[PDB]
Amino acid sequence: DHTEITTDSLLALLGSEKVKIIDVRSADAYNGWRMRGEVRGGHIKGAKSLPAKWLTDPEWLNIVRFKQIRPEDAIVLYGYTPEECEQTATRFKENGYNNVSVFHRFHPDWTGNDAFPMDRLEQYNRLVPAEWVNGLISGEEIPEYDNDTFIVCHAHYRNRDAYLSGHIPGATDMDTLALESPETWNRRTPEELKKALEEHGITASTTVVLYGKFMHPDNADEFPGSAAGHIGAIRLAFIMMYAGVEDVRVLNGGYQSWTDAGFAISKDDVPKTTVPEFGAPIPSRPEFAVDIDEAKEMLQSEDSDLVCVRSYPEYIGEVSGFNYIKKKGRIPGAIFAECGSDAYHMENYRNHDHTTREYHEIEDIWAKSGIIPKKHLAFYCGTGWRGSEAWFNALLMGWPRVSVYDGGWFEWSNDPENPYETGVP
Ligand SMILES: */[SH]=c1/[nH]cc(C[C@@H](C(=O)O)[N+](C)(C)C)[nH]1
Ligand SMILES: [Br-]
Ligand SMILES: [Cl-]
Ligand SMILES: [Mg+2]
């Protein structure tokens, strides 16, 4: 039936390839959130992330095999309690994984003893869990927060129904058109950004928690981006951090994470409180956004490289990805980092619950193509949405020189004098 591994045995196996240490806690605890008040947040060094809440996913066995977890591997599960990994161990044993052990002493033994190595997402407090947002709006004391004023922002693209059909209590909505211009789909000018943030009640010293709602985008609609709300949320996070909002948060997973926790929702139309001054020059961090001239300079630079976060059909020129762009092709010289199925999904950068994919798997995929934190990188896609999320992931890992090429394929292909390749490489 069972098998236990002690702290002594597990420590002498952290480098072994045939053992797979599996963290069954939440992805937010995996990244470094001290969800139980532990003195050290994060995961055991070398652990893979497989939250036990995914056991209800009928694709659980495919998620396991997409993580290269093979039946001949020595499975080592752990969590906050050994009872957390019991239903996952049985789930493995019935599917042919006969070598399955459970590590009992991750908390407080492994966490409360510095001799045991742990790892965490370097900027994890920017990727907040649902419990953190609940305590924030409830006035309760929470870690990783020490501010007076905050604003929860529900993001969407010309679809206020996404906000009115159910949102977080006290939350105000923000159309993506408040921060990006429809003529270029780039960030707005500083004066427009200053005026837009003030009429939403955002100052430079205001903590902004951003999130969106996944509403199953279909490529047959007029505005599929009106259903990819959480992508626009991270897209708005990049713009605010570019503008100068010093403390910007993102609810990991979006509206799905709020309802999964079981918290109350509101359907009210909360009015916007206005603030008279933003209080900081815009943009305060202009290095986060590059334009077309510097993007062309980064292609020929040995120190730089562009990252194409688009789908494979767009990359080979089969489709343009959008119903308002007609030219198909790819920018020559960029490194391909596939986002997923189409222009409104991020399968390769997300779990099924829309939380950010295990960042180690993101680093390993990026590393195989030469995408490393030593370079100055500018992520881009069609118009900057999918590139903003890829940039946010690299920002969360503490990469020192990452940016977004706002123009993307939209601005690039609009100039006939700009080159582009097509077809399979
Ligand atoms: S990178 C690309 N993927 C989605 C979006 C949003 C886009 C759309 O809805 O097509 N705009 C909101 C119009 C910019 N950008
Ligand atoms: Br989304
Ligand atoms: Cl491209
Ligand atoms: Mg743009």
Taking each continuous run of H as one helix and of E as one strand, the counts in the chain are 14, 17
Which resolution, in Å, applies to this structure?
2.8
State if residue 380 touches ligand 1 by the CB under 6 angstroms criterion.
no
State if residue 392 touches ligand 1 by the CB under 6 angstroms criterion.
no
Q: Looking at ligand 1, which residue's alpha carbon is closest to its atom 9?
A: 225
Closest among 336, 334, 322 to 385, alpha carbons compared: 322
Q: Tell me: is residue 360 an annotated ligand-binding position.
A: yes
CATH architecture of 4-120: 3-Layer(aba) Sandwich (3.40)
State if residue 156 touches ligand 1 by the CB under 6 angstroms criterion.
no
Closest atom of ligand 1 relative to the 157 alpha carbon: 12
How many A from CA of 331 to the centre of ligand 3? 4
- Alpha helix positions (H), 113-176: 130-137, 161-164
Q: What is the CATH number of domain 286-413?
A: 3.40.250.10
Closest among 43, 54, 116, 122 to 76, alpha carbons compared: 43
Cβ atoms 355, 284 nearer than 8 A: no
Tokens encoding 384 = 């900057």
CA distance 243 to 197: 9
CA distance 156 to 248: 17
- CA 146 to chain CA centroid, Å, is 23
Closest among 256, 259, 236 to 248, alpha carbons compared: 236
CA distance 272 to 198: 10
Task: Among 234, 383, 386, name the best residue to mutate to test ligand 1's pocket (greatest count of ligand atoms within 8 A of Cβ).
Answer: 383
Q: Give the Å distances, CA to CA, from 100 to 25, 26, 86, 93, 309.
A: 17, 20, 10, 7, 37
Residue labelled with tokens 């109350």: 264
CA distance 172 to 175: 10
Instruction: Determine the 3-state secondary structure of 28 from DSSP.
Output: helix
* CB neighbours of residue 39 within 10 Å: 11
Residue 68 CB-density burial (10 A; 0-12 exposed, 13-18 middle, 19+ buried): exposed
State if residue 212 touches ligand 1 by the CB under 6 angstroms criterion.
no
Q: Tell me: is residue 383 an annotated ligand-binding position.
A: yes
Q: Tell me: is residue 81 an annotated ligand-binding position.
A: no
Q: Tell me: is residue 268 an annotated ligand-binding position.
A: no
How many A from CA of 183 to the centre of ligand 4? 10
Cα dihedral across residues 301, 304, 310, 312: positive or negative: positive
How many A from CA of 161 to the centre of ligand 2? 15
Q: What is the dihedral of CA 180, 283, 211, 41, to 10 degrees?
A: 150
65 phi, psi to nearest 5 deg: -75, -30
Task: Among 311, 347, 385, name the best residue to mutate to test ligand 1's pocket (greatest count of ligand atoms within 8 A of Cβ).
Answer: 385
Instruction: Name residues whose C-beta falls within 8 Å of residue 99's C-beta, 6 or more positions apart in sequence.
Output: 72, 73, 74, 75
Q: Tell me: is residue 43 an annotated ligand-binding position.
A: yes
In the chain, where the domains are located: 4-120, 125-261, 286-413
Residues forming beta bridges with residue 128, ordered by sequence position:
251
CA distance 155 to 204: 19
Residues forming beta bridges with residue 173, ordered by sequence position:
154
User: How does DSSP assign 147-158, residue by residue?
Assistant: -S-EEEEEEESS
* Bridge pairing between strands 127-128 and 402-405: unpaired
State if residue 409 touches ligand 1 by the CB under 6 angstroms criterion.
no
Ramachandran class of 12: left when φ > 0, alpha when ψ lies in -120 to 50, beta otherwise: alpha
Confirm whether 339 is a catalytic residue.
Answer: no
- CA 277 to chain CA centroid, Å, is 30
How many A from CA of 415 to the centre of ligand 1? 19
Tokens encoding 200 = 């939403």
Q: Identical fold at 4-120 and 286-413?
A: yes
Closest atom of ligand 1 relative to the 309 alpha carbon: 1
Cβ atoms 75, 92 nearer than 8 A: yes
Closest among 365, 364, 314 to 344, alpha carbons compared: 314
Q: Which ligand is nearest to the CA of 382?
A: 1
State if residue 381 touches ligand 1 by the CB under 6 angstroms criterion.
yes
Closest among 196, 317, 315, 212 to 254, alpha carbons compared: 212
Please determine, looking at this structure, whether the domain spanning 125-261 carries the CATH number 2.60.40.1120. no
Cα dihedral across residues 64, 68, 74, 77: positive or negative: negative
Cβ atoms 28, 52 nearer than 8 A: no
State if residue 386 touches ligand 1 by the CB under 6 angstroms criterion.
yes
Q: Tell me: is residue 270 an annotated ligand-binding position.
A: no
Residues near ion ligand 3 (CB < 5 Å) are: 308, 330-331
How many A from CA of 102 to the centre of ligand 2? 35
Chain length of the chain: 425
Catalytic member of 85, 308, 339, 381: 381
